[PDB]
Ligand binder design. Structure first.
Ligand SMILES: [Zn+2]
Ligand SMILES: [Zn+2]
Lengths: 1648, 66, 49, 49, 49
């Protein structure tokens, strides 16, 4: 007969009306057979968990030791392939402990026994399957009914009860294995004993059914209440006092309190599981009566509800107008009623939102919003086809109930029609063409009289929920579902982007920023959280609340009464409840109202209906409640659950503010008819929940136990098979690893579950062979094998990846380490190339091969479903869409794209994505693989899928048992896997493929520690340096170091990305023109537009990683094949593996380059599409046709980068202190290359920046912000400007800057950058000369195309050469020039004696310890013919600081970098240790005249090798052009310095007038420059100057003695003529400085 | 020439007529708003009467244009 | 020339239609008044329910 | 000045504007009669209740 | 003379105000039909009580 018991998992509620009907007077033939086999002691069907809990099997019944050995081998192979071999012992000992422990093994064996019984009985043509023994239990299956018996007690139940027991066993097996693997890899140890104690405690509860499921429902909020009760610091909590767990189950209370005592995070992990225990049987009479009561109950009068709806209309209007003014810069079309306020009128005329309308929203009762858009009454095919089952008409209610139950209950027959009067699904309504005219279908909703045949809704209970009285969703008529689609689409698209509260939640960046600010603020003491839960949310909404906003929405979209028919529609709709064997009465073909099974008319639509409107209403009354008490708040809405963030006020504390907020929310929730219970709502400062994620103290709680124990439906759109089970298991592990679960935990658990899933379905011949099991787990779907979690690189990385090099590396590791030959790999893979190339498989999956996929379950997919719908379609919308073969067009376009001369599959797929045929095949894919299309595809030949499952099983057993080998893969499992993957792609496709092969990162880089590293490892290395010794504390505590027609738009953007990198082909332009014509754009031209993985993010804040791989790969503009996010994630995974295996990180470590053939120079190459494209376009698939309205690059990019950096500095000075520590910029400045900035000429950029700053002409406070944040080392853009200006070639090449550099005196490199960027405000003197270089056309270059010009800036320019300057060299006997070395502010003599020593000892190599001062090291680097090899010991911070000081490039040329990083100890002649052989030491000499022809007086006598060697007889040699070590900005000539004296006097006097800027540090700069003046002034220099400063008559008078009383005293000390340049600059013709001197500068000259 | 132009000129006249039709439009929008406030109460009362009975859904808005 | 400009303008008809616009304004005002009265009637209906 | 005379042409527009104002006036009188009938109906509410 | 004659005539402004009075006539028709639809519901409410 028909197929029986067609489910293999629980997908339905557990109902017991059929069992009660069977036990009390049934005459059906199988009910008599079921009743004949029960015992005298027969339990009720709700007590099924009492009987299944007593099931026990004999110990060790299944021989699974080969599985344990295989699992250890697989994990050893993966860990060896990743080259992290210190985690190796940790992972296989976790798996060995799990499968040898008796309780976990017993649960696993119970799971295998349950799944084999499910496999034996499901999808069978046999009505009665006989005695099936499960330990002490014997099971008998009589169609839908199951009888279970142990000794003398029996239970008659349904098949769903048995599936619930099987799912409980499955979830517990998952939970125990996941608990063992998580306990192995975590600082707290094993918690398996607590899990076994929890299972035993819950299994020991002997209470009635409802009390049991009350405890199981209340287990999670009680534990959250315990954590909140112990760990709230600023708010009180009474949440734990609601629940009756302390008085009902004391042992469970004791267990939860001791888990609270050990670890609250463990309590929140353990308490969150809810489906590893059994499921309720729904009490349908009481729950059905209660729902039908709650849909028609009034808590508030209609007259109050309509007034409060008017009140909510006011705030809806206010928020919508605020959003429209913020986005469109203008007021919407409004009508102002009589009595409107004058402020509204003036703000309407001025186009502005005043910041006083937020507290006065009652003024918006007179502002009627007019038409803003129009209602789109044509849904797309995405929402139409899926996710719901429907009812055609109200004459089809008789097919949801049994005829025998109607005869027994009421005494008459059902008069059921033969046919089902139309479709039962959305897709069948498409094929029969009832959805051809959507506006004619929705016209009754416009007129407000929906037809009589559309007013029915069936309430269906939901599955796998712990409510004993049930929760019901709605199954509705087709017309109301189309109404829901149109209304939800209209509110989601047109209204909610203007509503700010919903718009911050819809945007990912604003939500991310809000959650990060909430994470930082809760621990300090501000921003507490209120959680509100509405238990009766969907039932509580009433027509009178919704009607005014629905009237406004109907006026906004020019649709008559469309939004107002949903409010009054439930008053006319018949409601019945889907319960077979409990049918409603029929009087004249219609249901009869009884209050239990039927209701003629209610006051609410149901659950899920009107979801978007209700969120708006709830948010409106919450904004009213919070704005009446003056709080700063943020609402995160999740429908019935609402999370409110309240920030602290200065006047009040958090408790009083929390009580006021709770009272306001209760008041305005009660006025809407949605009464909040005090038992269901809470406040906290330590716990919150968003997005099904739970945060404790700002850190997300691990979700390994909840996610890995979840049972999925599997076998999607298909018959049951092994491939779908392996695929859904692999997808579950991938989803877990993406959702903040450890990669190792999910990987080990997935390997274990993969072997158990094989053990259920495979014979003992396969399963007792260890090597076959290991290979079969390591083959994977990349080379034609089964879906395995072991071959996914997406577990450990977040971006797009290539599986094939990783796969070949795994098989190489398998052959080399494990005793598995290549012949066995040839046996398992069975590589079979296709005879002809199928290019459509390449355009869908670029990384694939042309091989046969033999284990894939076969539905014909491409042609059979197209033929079926094009034959059986009885109306339009299918005939127009499928008038031509879509697959033949797709293959024709694929052959057109396969004519690319360098065949690039990524660009091939990208160009295929811009086609109509891709959209058509997507709609066919939704017709094949989606929800509720399983019904049609499985129902056509509903019997044949049962035989197809057996045929597929026999096929896969015969395929795995076959011993013949396939294609020999020995050339592709030796050597480099990058080249092996490329050669396999060329072998299998027939042509070379460019751009899809990404090298494996563990082959490309190998990790090492610095304690034994040599010099050759440091040539191409990535260095990681920790700031502290890292342990398991630092894995959780953060550290110091930082972390439709829219296709047409894409059709141009990719086009621009083609045109700017200079690919030009007639055929490609023809093809994209055909795409533009098929999508309706007939216009000829339009030119318009760190971070890691989340599991190593906290650990990455303790490490500094940099790119010093430039000795072979980053010294050139040629790009290579390195994906840096993967490499940094891999290095952080090395750190994580060292910590989690019991080690510490106390030294820097490295990633060295190992495989030289994985580093391929990428060929930036044009592609030419050879043959003429034969695609011709479609034009019949896009139903909504879009309308036509709807210089060298270097200079344009220069001006655009200048204005972008200027506005970035502007939004930095407007940013607050918490915002400037973030790296966010205005237009995404961070992800830009460094090389193209070196190619870019920066003189144009500096003039563009300067002219944008002088064009802003900012107010005084913002200019004070500019000068303050640039004189300090703050701001991300200042770091960006430093990172650009790291090389001095860009410094010397700037032709303004070499002129400007005599003027400015810079203490540091960043000081020079700050003076360069903020000089036009303080000095217009050089602006008068270089303001002439302005061009208005380059200013008009837009920002949005700037990145496109960034693609052009990389190739045109060139990088400069860099030059080595000179310092004093000394040696032999000569003339004394001036002996100038570090006379600015540093001990020059320390450099002098060391230069004299190193020159007379004639050393060729010098070794410098990091204890030596950096400027002495700068002088020792600027000496020629010397190699400085520093002692870094693996830490590049000293060399980088030494490099940042210098301005020539001799530090980057005379230092041997691999030998410097590979040096730890004394190996030569050194400066820096205290005493030893070959150590230069400094000894203080108190009195010596230092009789030397060169230098005048000695302070330090240099000693070496416990000896003094005479440095008194040497002298100098000639000098040449100097570096900025000698500081030529203040050289011998004074007229540049007098210009600086002219400027700094003008600098301070202008900055006194600047508001918000107190001139102490800028005055200190003025003090240093006037100390340089005081060297030469010739009047006595006071060490302390009282130095009164103040403005008189808009003229700043500043001098030592107070000229007037209003001057302010500034204390300046430490002035002395210490540099020797005092004697040098003393010149002839005194009074020349007095010529052209300001009188104030003369007053500072002659001191008092 | 000027006299024929000054009897032909009606800039002030056409501006007065256009402004008066704008007054008519504003008064009509006010009447439409008050009529909608009437419709809310009568439709909610009829729907409140309809619950529990077999009363038809009567039309509230006339027809879509064209 | 003169007779064409005489043909293309009708000033007296402009004055008549302006007076008729004023009549339309008066009728609009009395309809607003009777809407206000039946507003009051429907409101006192809905209050007593 | 023939083309400027054709762009001077207002004789059809004022006549059809008079037709539009006339049909608006008749529409308002019919709606006012409907308003009177509606008030006569809605006064029966408190007669019944 | 010519620019004064430009100031005499705008056919487009008269056409805009003609369409502007026709849309007001359409609004009158919609309100009349909707108010009769209200009349049917209040008639059934008289029949109910
Ligand atoms: Zn390699
Ligand atoms: Zn230098």
């Amino acid at each position: 007969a028909g197929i029986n018991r067609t489910d293999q998992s629980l997908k339905n509620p557990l109902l017991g009306t059929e069992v009660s009907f069977c036990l009390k007077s049934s005459s059906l033939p199988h009910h008599v057979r079921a009743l004949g086999q029960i015992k005298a002691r027969n339990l009720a069907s709700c007590d099924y968990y009492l009987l299944f809990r007593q099931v026990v099997l004999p110990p060790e019944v299944y021989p699974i030791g080969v599985l344990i050995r295989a699992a250890e081998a697989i994990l050893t192979v993966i860990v060896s392939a990743w080259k992290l071999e210190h985690m190796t012992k940790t992972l296989y000992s976790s798996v060995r402990y799990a499968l040898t422990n008796p309780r976990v093994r017993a649960q696993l064996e119970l799971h295998i026994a349950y799944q084999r019984i499910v496999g034996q009985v499901s999808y069978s043509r046999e009505a009665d399957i006989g005695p099936k023994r499960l330990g002490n239990m014997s099971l008998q299956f009589v169609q839908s009914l199951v009888i279970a018996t142990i000794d003398t007690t029996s239970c008659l139940m349904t098949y769903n009860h048995f599936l619930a027991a099987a799912d409980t066993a499955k979830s517990r097996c998952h939970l125990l294995i996941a608990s063992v693997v998580q306990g192995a890899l975590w600082e707290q140890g094993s918690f398996l004993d607590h899990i076994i104690n929890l299972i035993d405690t819950i299994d020991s509860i002997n209470l009635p059914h409802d009390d049991y499921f009350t405890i199981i429902k209340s287990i999670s909020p009680y534990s959250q209440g315990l954590v909140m009760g112990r760990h709230n610091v600023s708010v009180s909590s009474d949440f734990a006092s609601v629940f009756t767990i302390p008085e009902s189950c004391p042992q469970l209370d004791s267990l939860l309190k001791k888990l609270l005592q050990l670890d609250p995070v463990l309590l929140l992990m353990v308490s969150s599981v809810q489906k590893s225990w059994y499921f309720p049987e729904i009490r349908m009479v009481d729950g059905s009566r209660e729902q039908l009561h709650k849909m028609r109950v009034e808590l508030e009068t209609p007259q109050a509800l309509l007034s409060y709806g008017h009140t909510l209309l006011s705030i809806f209007r206010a928020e919508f107008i605020k959003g429209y003014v913020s986005k469109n810069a203008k007021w919407p079309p409004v009508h102002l009623l009589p009595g409107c306020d004058k402020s509204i009128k003036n703000a309407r005329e001025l186009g502005r939102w005043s910041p006083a309308f937020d507290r006065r929203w009652q003024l918006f009762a007179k502002v009627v919003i007019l038409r803003i858009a129009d209602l789109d009454m044509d849904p797309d095919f995405n929402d139409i086809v899926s996710d719901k089952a429907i009812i055609s008409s109200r004459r089809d209610w008789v097919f949801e109930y049994n005829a025998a139950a109607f005869w027994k209950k009421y005494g008459e027959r059902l008069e059921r029609p033969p046919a089902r009067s139309g479709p039962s699904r959305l897709v069948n309504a498409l094929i029969d063409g009832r959805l051809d005219n959507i506006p004619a279908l929705l016209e009754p909703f416009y007129r407000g009289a929906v037809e009589f045949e559309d007013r029915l809704t069936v309430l269906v209970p939901k599955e796998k929920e712990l409510k004993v009285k049930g929760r019901f969703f709605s199954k509705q008529t087709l017309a109301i579902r189309i109404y829901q689609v149109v209304a939800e689409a209209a509110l989601k698209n047109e209204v909610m982007p203007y509503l700010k509260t919903h718009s911050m939640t819809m945007s990912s960046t604003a939500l991310t920023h809000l959650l990060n600010r909430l994470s930082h603020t809760i621990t300090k003491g501000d921003s507490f959280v209120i959680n509100l839960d509405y238990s009766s949310w969907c039932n509580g909404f009433r027509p009178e609340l919704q009607a005014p906003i629905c009237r406004q929405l109907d006026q906004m979209f020019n649709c008559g009464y469309f939004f107002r028919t949903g409010c009054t529609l439930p008053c006319f709709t018949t409601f019945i409840i889907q319960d077979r064997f409990n049918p409603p009465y029929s009087f004249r073909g219609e249901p009869v109202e009884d209050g239990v099974t039927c209701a003629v008319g209610t006051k609410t639509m149901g659950e899920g209906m009107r979801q978007k409107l209700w969120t708006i209403l709830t948010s409106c009354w919450e904004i009213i409640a919070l704005r009446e008490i003056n709080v700063t708040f943020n609402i995160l809405g999740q429908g019935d659950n609402q999370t409110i963030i309240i920030h602290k006020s200065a006047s009040q504390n958090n408790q009083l503010l929390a009580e006021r907020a709770l009272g306001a929310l209760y008041k305005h929730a009660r006025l809407a008819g949605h009464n909040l219970k005090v038992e269901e709502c809470w406040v906290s400062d330590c716990l919150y929940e968003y997005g099904k994620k739970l945060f404790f103290r700002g850190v997300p709680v691990p979700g390994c136990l909840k996610q890995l124990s979840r049972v999925t439906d599997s076998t999607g759109e298909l018959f049951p098979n092994l491939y779908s089970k392996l695929a859904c298991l692999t997808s579950s592990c991938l989803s877990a690893a993406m959702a903040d679960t450890s990669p190792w935990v999910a990987l080990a658990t997935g390997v274990c579950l993969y072997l158990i899933e094989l053990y259920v379905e495979l014979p003992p011949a396969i399963m007792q062979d260890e090597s076959l099991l290991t290979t079969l787990c390591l083959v994977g779907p990349s080379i034609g094998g089964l879906p395995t979690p072991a071959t996914l690189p997406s577990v450990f990385f977040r971006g797009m990846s290539d599986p094939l090099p990783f796969q070949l590396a795994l098989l190489q590791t398998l052959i080399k380490t494990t005793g598995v030959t290549c012949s066995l790999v040839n046996r398992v893979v069975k590589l079979r190339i296709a005879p002809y190339p199928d290019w459509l498989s390449l355009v869908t999956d670029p990384t694939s091969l042309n091989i046969a996929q033999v284990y894939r379950p076969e539905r014909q997919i491409r042609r059979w479903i197209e033929e079926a719908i094009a034959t059986s379609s009885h109306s339009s919308r299918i005939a127009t869409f499928f008038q031509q073969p879509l697959t033949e067009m797709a293959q024709l376009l694929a052959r057109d794209l396969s004519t690319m001369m360098p065949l690039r599959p990524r660009d091939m797929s990208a160009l295929f994505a811009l086609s109509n045929v891709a959209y058509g095949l997507s709609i066919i894919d939704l017709f094949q693989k989606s929800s509720t299309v399983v019904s049609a595809s499985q129902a056509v030949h509903i019997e044949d899928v049962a035989l197809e499952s057996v045929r597929y099983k026999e096929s896969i057993i015969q395929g795995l048992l076959d011993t013949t080998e396939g294609y020999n893969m020995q050339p592709y499992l030796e050597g480099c896997t990058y080249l092996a993957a490329k050669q396999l792609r060329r072998l299998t496709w027939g042509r070379d493929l460019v751009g899809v092969t990404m090298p494996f990162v563990a082959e490309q880089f190998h990790p090492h520690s610095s304690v034994g590293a040599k010099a050759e490892l440091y040539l191409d290395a990535i260095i990681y340096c920790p700031q502290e010794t890292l342990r398991s504390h630092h894995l959780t505590t953060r550290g110091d170091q930082p972390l439709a027609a829219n296709l047409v738009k894409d059709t141009l953007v990719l086009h621009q990305w083609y045109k700017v990198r200079k690919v030009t082909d007639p055929h490609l332009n023809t093809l994209m023109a055909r795409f533009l014509l098929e999508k309706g754009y007939t216009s000829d031209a339009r030119p318009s537009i760190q971070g890691l993985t989340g599991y190593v993010n906290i650990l990455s804040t303790w490490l500094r990683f940099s790119s010093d791989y430039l000795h072979s790969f980053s010294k050139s503009s040629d790009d290579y094949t390195i994906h840096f996010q993967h490499v940094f994630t891999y290095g952080c995974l090395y750190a994580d593996s060292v910590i989690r295996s019991g080690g510490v990180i106390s030294t820097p470590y490295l990633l060295s380059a190992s495989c030289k053939t994985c580093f391929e120079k990428i060929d930036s190459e044009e592609f030419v599409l050879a043959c003429e494209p034969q695609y011709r376009g479609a034009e019949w698939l896009i139903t909504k046709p879009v309308t036509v309205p709807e210089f060298d690059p270097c200079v344009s990019a220069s001006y655009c980068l200048g204005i972008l950096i200027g506005k970035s500095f502007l939004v930095d000075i407007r940013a607050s202190g918490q915002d400037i520590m973030e790296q966010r910029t205005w237009a995404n400045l961070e992800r830009f290359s460094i090389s193209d900035m070196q190619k870019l000429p920066w003189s144009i950029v500096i003039r563009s920046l300067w002219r944008f700053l002088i064009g802003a002409r900012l107010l005084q406070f913002e200019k004070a912000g500019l000068i303050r944040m640039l004189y300090a080392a703050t701001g991300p853009t200042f770091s960006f400007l430093m990172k650009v200006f790291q090389d001095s070639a860009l410094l010397m090449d700037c032709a303004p800057l070499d002129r400007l550099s005599p003027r400015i005196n810079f203490h540091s490199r960043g000081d020079l950058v700050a003076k360069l960027v903020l000089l036009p405000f303080i000095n217009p003197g050089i602006v008068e000369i270089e303001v002439s270089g302005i061009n208005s056309k380059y200013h008009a270059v837009s920002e949005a195309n700037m990145d496109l010009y960034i693609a052009a800036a990389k190739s045109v320019g060139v990088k400069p050469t860099q030059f080595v300057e000179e310092t004093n060299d000394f040696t032999a006997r000569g003339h004394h020039h001036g002996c100038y070395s570090l006379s600015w502010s540093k001990s020059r003599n320390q450099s002098q004696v060391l230069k004299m020593v190193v020159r007379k000892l004639k050393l060729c190599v010098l070794y410098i310890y990091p204890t030596v001062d950096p400027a002495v090291a700068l002088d020792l680097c600027h000496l020629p013919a010397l190699t400085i090899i520093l002692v870094l010991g693996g830490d590049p911070a000293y060399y980088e600081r030494l490099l940042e000081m210098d301005l020539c490039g001799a530090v980057s040329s005379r230092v041997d970098i691999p030998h410097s990083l590979a040096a730890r100890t004394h190996k030569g002649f050194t400066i820096g240790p205290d005493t030893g052989p070959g150590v230069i030491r400094l000894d203080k000499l108190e009195s010596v005249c230092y009789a030397h022809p060169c230098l005048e007086e000695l302070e330090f006598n240099a000693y070496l090798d416990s000896e003094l060697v005479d440095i008194s007889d040497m002298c100098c040699l000639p000098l040449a052009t100097p570096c900025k070590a000698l500081f030529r900005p203040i050289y011998r000539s004074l007229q540049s310095f007098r210009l600086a004296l002219m400027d700094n006097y003008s600098f301070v006097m202008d900055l006194i007038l600047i508001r918000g800027l107190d001139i102490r540090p800028h005055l200190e700069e003025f003090d240093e420059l006037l100390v340089v003046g005081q060297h030469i002034l010739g009047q006595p220099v006071l060490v302390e100057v009282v130095y009164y400063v103040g403005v008189v008559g808009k003229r700043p008078v500043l001098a030592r003695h107070p000229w007037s009383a209003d001057l302010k005293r500034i204390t300046v000390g430490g002035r002395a003529p210490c540099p020797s340049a005092a004697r040098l600059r003393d010149e002839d013709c005194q009074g020349s400085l007095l010529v052209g001197l300001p009188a104030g500068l003369t007053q500072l000259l002659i001191i008092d | 020439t000027i006299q024929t132009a000054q009897r032909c000129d009606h800039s002030d006249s056409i501006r007065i007529l256009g402004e008066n039709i704008k007054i008519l439009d504003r008064s009509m929008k006010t009447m439409m708003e008050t009529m909608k406030l009437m419709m809310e109460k009568v439709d909610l009362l009829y729907a409140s009467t309809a619950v529990g009975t077999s009363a038809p859904m009567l039309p509230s808005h006339p027809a879509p244009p064209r």
